[PDB]
Amino acid sequence: VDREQLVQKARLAEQAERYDDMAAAMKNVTELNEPLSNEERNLLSVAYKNVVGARRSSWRVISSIEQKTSADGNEKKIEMVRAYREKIEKELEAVCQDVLSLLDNYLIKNCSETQYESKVFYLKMKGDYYRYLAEVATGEKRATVVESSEKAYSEAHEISKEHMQPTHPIRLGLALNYSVFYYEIQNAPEQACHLAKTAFDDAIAELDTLNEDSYKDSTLIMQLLRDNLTLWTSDQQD
């Protein structure tokens, strides 16, 4: 049972664009109950984000085709579409629960109060993947994950505010995804636009507090915060 053997396989799999093998390898590493490095934190996020991202992309396409052919009125055709959408939804829910189990039982739990960085990162993922579930959930089921996602981001923000400067790529990443949670899942555009701008402006104010490494990586995220504020405002005026 060689760890650095697995982490090699994860990288090797990432190159071959095999994110099922990459996610598998990285899950096995996390199961060793030992803390992940900044590189290993990344290899995990990348791996699973791809695995679930391809499902979400495939879900949006089936939903779109189900919105259009629905008004067409073809019974037998609609059924299989909805059935196929149900197929992909279950694959998606399966991956989210898999990551959330890895988070709640291996990662977030075993993080002391001296590793505030990884704490927020994992807390963000816990919110991200609960949000993926909310995107396809319905009824009282959806309300449950929305609160679960809300509770994950909210806590990830508190730790960020207090121990991380607004110019940190993780705080910028959290604020980015957290806002999207407010606009897309909560449909609270004013609170989403507010959190997006507050995070952005707070990055400007302490702009001189940049490190050479995060100087490019963190600013890449800031433009993303603007792109959303661009698209969000233009929809309200219509």
Binding site: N42, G173, L176, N177, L224, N228
Partner: peptide
């Protein structure tokens, strides 16, 4: 879909 990040 609004842009996002994980890295």
């Amino acid at each position: 879909v609004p842009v996002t990040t994980a890295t």
